[PDB]
Amino acid sequence: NIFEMLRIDEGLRLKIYKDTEGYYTIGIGHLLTKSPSLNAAKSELDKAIGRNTNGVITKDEAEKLFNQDVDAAVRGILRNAKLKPVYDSLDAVRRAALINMVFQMGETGVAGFTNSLRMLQQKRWDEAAVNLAKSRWYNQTPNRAKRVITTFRTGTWDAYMCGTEGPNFYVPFSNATGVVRSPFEYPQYYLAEPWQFSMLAAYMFLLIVLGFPINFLTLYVTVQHKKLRTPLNYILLNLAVADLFMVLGGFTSTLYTSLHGYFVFGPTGCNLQGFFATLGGEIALWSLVVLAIERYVVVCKPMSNFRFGENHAIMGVAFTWVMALACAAPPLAGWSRYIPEGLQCSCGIDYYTLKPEVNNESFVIYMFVVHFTIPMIIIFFCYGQLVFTVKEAAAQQQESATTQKAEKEVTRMVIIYVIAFLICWVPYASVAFYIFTHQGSCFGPIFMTIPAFFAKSAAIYNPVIYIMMNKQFRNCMLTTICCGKNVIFKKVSRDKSVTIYLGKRDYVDHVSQVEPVDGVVLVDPELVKGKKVYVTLTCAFRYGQEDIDVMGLTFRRDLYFSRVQVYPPVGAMSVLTQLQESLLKKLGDNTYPFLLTFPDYLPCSVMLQPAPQDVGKSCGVDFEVKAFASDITDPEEDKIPKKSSVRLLIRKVQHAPPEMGPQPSAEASWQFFMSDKPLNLSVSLSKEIYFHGEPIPVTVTVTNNTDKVVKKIKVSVEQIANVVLYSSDYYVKPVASEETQEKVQPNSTLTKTLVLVPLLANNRERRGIALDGKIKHEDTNLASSTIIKEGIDRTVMGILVSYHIKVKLTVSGFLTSSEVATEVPFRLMHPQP
């Protein structure tokens, strides 16, 4: 209060200055020295402040120098016999008014006032003000004195109110001079220079010219191209719609008002403009939150690519709109208010004026805390854990150079995503926070404009980073902006220069050693002249759509890759197979062999079954042998010519081993909370390795010694899908299940054998079911049980599969039913042909 009074009146000067008297004075009238030496002023200043100030002190240090004057002056008041009784009689507010008089004029000046101090002591306010107004002090500084004189009369701080309050608005300017008029009626040129209103008109023009085409084109291009319309882009499309609301609802209205210099549309127009401006900004904000969440879950976990259909994307866009309306609507319906901010041209949320009628305190806290901290925590956690996962994954296999380029591009974008987010919302949050902590201080119209500059700029530069810098949207917009443009077997290329040959598609995987790829490649001498032909082995994990995944941040992960040269070779092949010799003799002179081997740490060819409604969803591992021609040296694999290249997929299939494992026989006992009797259960199977389409007799044996009755006995052939890509993520699912209606009595034993037949036909139309890798959309069978080599060095990435018979006993216990269950593992694989 008192500090804010004297700061407005005397004026807070930070550096050392010579006052009207010509003495070295610092801060709010805080004297330093009477000597003509400047270093003498520095001497007392440095000692008082406590550091090398060099004349320059902080605003808080000037506040402490002022508080020392407050303490010293108050002591001086109590020392004086005329001032002490008046100080004691008056309240805290009028005491501060007296201190203002004692500050400038000194004890000497204030001591001379006989009549006023008598009347002030006698609780006569009006005639005291009349006497004070008729003095030298009012003549000296009528600006300062008039404010203090009114304070003595009223006993309130109304004279010291920073701006000019109103029914539907708040102007940050003093009406003491008598120039303030309504922003909904008259011009506001008294706030700032007229050319700055033209600057605002030029600025809003720039936002419309840049903002509308970018966001409209985003939607227009999406309507044309089928490629873009995918669930992940749904949230990016919502961002485009949000920014369009900021243009049409916000900037165009602000442009019209900035030209005139005041808000012409009135309170109704201010509510609607501020509503769309907030809605556009908030939908844009929560769109980026959802985008961060989506990109974290979808990339790190490959299973979620299937999960994320249109309905989940709609929920993300819905949540965005709900959170936006949750904070945009209350200003209309009482909680806070939309008023003209800054220059009283743009309408926005009232986060400066504390009005308990509309409850701004609770609203600014609710908004600030929720809408700032929750995105900050979620987005930094999302992209933070994303980069954390990718950097650790990139370090796991440094041999793959393709992953390193991705990891680099990713980290570069994530740094820019953070910078764009902070530059956008930190100005508003920091200023709103600083205004809340320092409420007594004044804030100009241009001061409130600085956050508005960066936030409305985000309407432009967010589409740049999230849409324009996006790889798919960049190439799609390129098309629209430029008007539509810019037995042994083989496979021939498109240009028909290179022709690959392979003996078989299905390559076998024995536990010890993998059966290698063998074949040849025919080449045209005339077409391939002064070029380098490479035969390449590639193992790849695929998840999601091909175009969309490259665009988001980083693309599908290759489990293993190995390229090999062919024409011309370093020497030749060491020794040839019967296949290569046969092909060389059959084919002409321009045939060159290759031998590509698999290491021991790779998975099998496994895909996951989609639902019939899932038209555009696919995830699965597959092997690809590819051959191509190129002008560039070895490391230019990352990019390839589409025309010269030819690719033919293969499988790393595992047949069942000749010797069967031990006969599975699991056993487990149970107890209960009241009854301490044992319930012994023992399971047993026929084989360790079952084959596809084979009956599985599960000879369950249950010996009941407990008081409780069992309701039923259910057996289930459960497929555990262990998916590993970034982290180890198991996924259990049932395949086949049969249950008996028989009941086991107390002190009674039972021996039953239930047969189960796991088949693909019965398990059709189900999401998440792992299958053996298809060649070309043909019919297949349930996924084979994956086998891993003993005590290997590297971890096995990819989709690992395993089966287990899970018997569960529905026990009728004390209406409530207890469900105990146990598992036993087994294998489902193809037989040796």
Side-chain angles (χ1 to χ4, degrees), residues 1-74 76-544 546-550 552-554 556-572 574-616 618-833:
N1 293 334
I2 184 167
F3 168 64
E4 309 300 336
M5 288 169 73
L6 276 292
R7 174 161 163 246
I8 297 162
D9 287 7
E10 175 57 38
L12 202 159
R13 179 58 176 170
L14 299 168
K15 296 198 176 190
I16 294 173
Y17 69 97
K18 285 197 172 186
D19 66 330
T20 51
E21 296 282 61
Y23 291 112
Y24 291 89
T25 314
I26 195 161
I28 313 171
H30 180 80
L31 199 67
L32 291 175
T33 186
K34 65 183 178 292
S35 178
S37 185
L38 173 58
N39 292 14
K42 182 181 70 65
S43 186
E44 289 288 349
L45 179 60
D46 289 20
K47 189 166 60 58
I49 298 296
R51 61 173 184 79
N52 296 352
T53 57
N54 201 5
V56 186
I57 57 167
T58 61
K59 187 190 167 195
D60 296 356
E61 278 171 13
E63 179 174 11
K64 295 285 156 60
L65 291 176
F66 175 80
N67 290 342
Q68 286 174 13
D69 290 13
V70 165
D71 192 286
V74 164
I77 287 163
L78 296 167
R79 277 190 294 273
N80 195 290
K82 301 163 187 171
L83 310 181
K84 182 189 184 293
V86 178
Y87 185 84
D88 294 333
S89 185
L90 296 171
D91 69 316
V93 179
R94 290 187 171 82
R95 281 170 188 179
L98 176 60
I99 293 161
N100 200 339
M101 295 176 67
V102 172
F103 254 65
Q104 189 183 350
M105 299 187 295
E107 186 187 328
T108 315
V110 177
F113 289 79
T114 308
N115 295 329
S116 300
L117 290 182
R118 188 195 288 277
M119 288 183 291
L120 286 162
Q121 190 179 357
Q122 291 177 340
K123 306 289 178 287
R124 304 181 77 181
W125 312 121
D126 290 21
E127 287 170 307
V130 169
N131 279 227
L132 290 162
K134 291 175 176 180
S135 69
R136 176 50 181 170
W137 171 53
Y138 181 71
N139 170 219
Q140 278 278 65
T141 55
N143 300 335
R144 182 165 178 180
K146 180 167 164 61
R147 290 192 293 279
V148 177
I149 290 159
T150 314
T151 308
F152 278 114
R153 292 203 297 184
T154 57
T156 60
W157 297 272
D158 293 20
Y160 286 91
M161 292 210 298
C162 175
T164 312
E165 302 198 46
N168 299 327
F169 59 88
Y170 177 88
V171 183
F173 198 86
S174 185
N175 196 23
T177 55
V179 299
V180 176
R181 286 282 166 273
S182 184
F184 300 118
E185 301 297 331
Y186 297 93
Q188 305 294 297
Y189 292 110
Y190 57 82
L191 277 166
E193 293 286 315
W195 67 266
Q196 289 196 335
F197 286 84
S198 302
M199 286 272 287
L200 185 61
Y203 181 74
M204 292 291 158
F205 174 77
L206 181 60
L207 294 183
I208 295 159
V209 172
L210 296 173
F212 178 75
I214 290 171
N215 296 304
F216 178 74
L217 183 64
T218 308
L219 299 174
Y220 187 87
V221 170
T222 305
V223 170
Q224 296 294 337
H225 288 259
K226 179 181 167 191
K227 328 304 137 79
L228 294 156
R229 296 186 39 185
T230 55
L232 279 158
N233 297 7
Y234 277 41
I235 199 71
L236 290 170
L237 290 162
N238 189 29
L239 182 62
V241 171
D243 295 322
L244 284 164
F245 280 130
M246 295 185 71
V247 173
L248 297 169
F251 306 145
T252 53
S253 291
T254 312
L255 174 56
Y256 195 82
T257 57
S258 61
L259 288 163
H260 290 93
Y262 69 102
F263 203 80
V264 303
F265 306 108
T268 53
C270 186
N271 290 353
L272 295 174
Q273 193 206 31
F275 180 68
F276 297 145
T278 304
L279 190 71
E282 291 290 7
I283 292 171
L285 173 53
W286 286 110
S287 287
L288 300 180
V289 173
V290 169
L291 181 61
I293 294 158
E294 284 173 10
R295 285 175 173 177
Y296 171 65
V297 300
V298 169
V299 175
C300 298
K301 288 174 181 174
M303 253 291 295
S304 54
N305 284 276
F306 264 123
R307 248 86 160 286
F308 199 64
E310 69 182 0
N311 294 126
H312 288 92
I314 289 289
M315 281 186 71
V317 171
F319 176 79
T320 304
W321 283 19
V322 168
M323 292 289 97
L325 290 168
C327 55
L332 300 172
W335 195 19
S336 195
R337 56 171 185 176
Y338 288 126
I339 58 167
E341 74 189 338
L343 300 164
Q344 312 296 295
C345 293
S346 57
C347 287
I349 297 168
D350 193 358
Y351 64 89
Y352 37 94
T353 309
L354 304 179
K355 191 166 186 175
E357 286 86 338
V358 290
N359 314 315
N360 288 3
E361 186 173 10
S362 57
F363 189 85
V364 168
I365 294 160
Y366 163 79
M367 273 273 288
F368 175 92
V369 173
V370 173
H371 287 65
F372 206 68
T373 319
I374 298 300
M376 276 196 309
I377 288 167
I378 291 170
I379 294 169
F380 276 62
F381 175 76
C382 283
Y383 294 128
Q385 289 289 336
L386 197 152
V387 171
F388 173 83
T389 305
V390 171
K391 281 190 177 291
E392 191 173 27
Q396 195 85 330
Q397 42 161 222
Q398 301 191 240
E399 66 188 40
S400 182
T402 326
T403 314
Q404 303 306 314
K405 294 185 186 180
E407 182 269 312
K408 167 57 194 173
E409 196 52 32
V410 168
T411 313
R412 192 175 68 79
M413 290 280 95
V414 169
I415 292 161
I416 289 168
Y417 289 137
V418 169
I419 289 163
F421 174 82
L422 292 169
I423 288 167
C424 174
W425 292 112
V426 171
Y428 256 121
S430 59
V431 167
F433 173 76
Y434 196 87
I435 288 161
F436 192 84
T437 53
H438 296 81
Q439 272 287 346
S441 306
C442 280
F443 303 89
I446 300 161
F447 192 83
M448 297 182 179
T449 315
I450 290 166
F453 165 79
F454 283 108
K456 298 173 188 172
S457 290
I460 305 299
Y461 67 74
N462 286 20
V464 173
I465 300 166
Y466 289 96
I467 312 299
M468 295 278 286
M469 282 182 183
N470 199 318
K471 199 169 157 126
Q472 180 173 17
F473 280 88
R474 190 166 66 258
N475 297 352
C476 291
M477 286 171 177
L478 175 67
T479 314
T480 308
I481 291 161
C482 301
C483 308
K485 210 152 188 170
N486 303 121
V487 72
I488 307 158
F489 44 82
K490 58 165 188 175
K491 191 186 175 181
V492 189
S493 184
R494 203 186 73 176
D495 65 332
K496 307 187 178 181
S497 190
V498 184
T499 306
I500 196 166
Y501 291 77
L502 285 175
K504 57 186 178 185
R505 281 175 185 277
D506 298 13
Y507 287 101
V508 182
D509 178 27
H510 307 276
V511 177
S512 58
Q513 56 177 10
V514 190
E515 194 164 41
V517 178
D518 52 339
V520 300
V521 280
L522 182 63
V523 189
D524 198 328
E526 296 296 332
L527 286 160
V528 186
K529 195 174 184 72
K531 295 190 174 72
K532 184 62 175 171
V533 183
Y534 290 100
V535 68
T536 69
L537 182 63
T538 305
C539 178
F541 198 115
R542 304 188 192 281
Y543 60 87
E546 298 184 339
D547 296 17
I548 69 99
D549 185 35
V550 183
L553 193 59
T554 170
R556 71 191 205 285
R557 190 181 192 77
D558 294 17
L559 303 176
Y560 183 83
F561 165 76
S562 57
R563 71 195 174 283
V564 175
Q565 50 190 334
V566 172
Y567 170 69
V570 173
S574 58
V575 187
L576 309 175
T577 60
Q578 296 183 12
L579 177 60
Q580 292 175 335
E581 290 174 35
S582 184
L583 282 158
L584 282 163
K585 292 167 68 171
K586 282 178 179 180
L587 299 167
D589 65 325
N590 305 317
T591 307
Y592 308 100
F594 64 91
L595 186 69
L596 289 155
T597 61
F598 306 94
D600 67 325
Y601 60 88
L602 304 192
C604 309
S605 183
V606 185
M607 62 164 285
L608 305 177
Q609 193 196 155
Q613 67 270 21
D614 293 2
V615 70
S618 58
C619 186
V621 185
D622 60 326
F623 297 79
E624 186 179 312
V625 183
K626 191 169 71 175
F628 56 85
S630 182
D631 300 313
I632 312 96
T633 46
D634 204 13
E636 191 63 30
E637 186 272 329
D638 294 35
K639 259 63 178 70
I640 30 73
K642 182 181 177 183
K643 70 189 184 178
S644 62
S645 58
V646 55
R647 62 192 66 183
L648 201 70
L649 69 136
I650 55 165
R651 309 197 299 186
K652 185 166 170 281
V653 184
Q654 280 185 346
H655 296 301
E659 72 312 346
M660 207 172 298
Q663 191 178 23
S665 294
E667 191 172 19
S669 300
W670 281 284
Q671 293 181 325
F672 291 95
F673 72 94
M674 264 287 290
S675 57
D676 68 323
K677 293 283 187 173
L679 178 61
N680 190 239
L681 178 66
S682 182
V683 188
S684 55
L685 298 171
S686 186
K687 294 182 171 184
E688 201 281 309
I689 306 167
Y690 286 89
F691 299 100
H692 288 100
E694 190 181 2
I696 306 169
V698 187
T699 309
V700 69
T701 56
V702 50
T703 57
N704 198 337
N705 301 331
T706 60
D707 296 26
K708 296 168 178 283
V709 165
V710 181
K711 197 78 176 188
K712 55 166 69 177
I713 306 170
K714 176 165 185 177
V715 186
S716 57
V717 183
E718 292 186 347
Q719 179 197 249
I720 183 164
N722 173 224
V723 188
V724 188
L725 208 170
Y726 289 103
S727 58
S728 183
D729 299 319
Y730 298 127
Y731 294 92
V732 66
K733 283 192 83 81
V735 180
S737 58
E738 297 298 330
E739 55 187 330
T740 190
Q741 207 73 38
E742 293 179 25
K743 53 176 180 175
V744 186
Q745 297 293 340
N747 307 337
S748 302
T749 63
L750 195 75
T751 297
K752 198 74 187 293
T753 168
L754 294 166
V755 180
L756 299 92
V757 188
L759 292 164
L760 190 143
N762 297 126
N763 282 252
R764 289 186 179 282
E765 318 296 60
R766 286 181 66 179
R767 297 180 180 177
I769 299 297
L771 317 175
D772 287 320
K774 293 176 176 182
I775 302 293
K776 285 186 171 186
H777 308 92
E778 71 186 346
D779 188 34
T780 188
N781 66 114
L782 295 165
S784 300
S785 303
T786 315
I787 305 171
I788 304 166
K789 191 172 184 178
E790 294 187 339
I792 57 166
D793 299 335
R794 302 189 177 182
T795 189
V796 184
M797 294 182 290
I799 304 168
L800 306 179
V801 185
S802 182
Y803 291 74
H804 70 277
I805 303 298
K806 184 169 186 288
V807 66
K808 60 181 75 176
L809 314 182
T810 310
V811 185
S812 62
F814 298 115
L815 266 287
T816 190
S817 299
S818 300
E819 295 185 343
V820 302
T822 178
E823 301 178 3
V824 54
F826 78 99
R827 296 174 179 177
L828 193 72
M829 288 184 289
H830 289 288
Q832 192 79 343

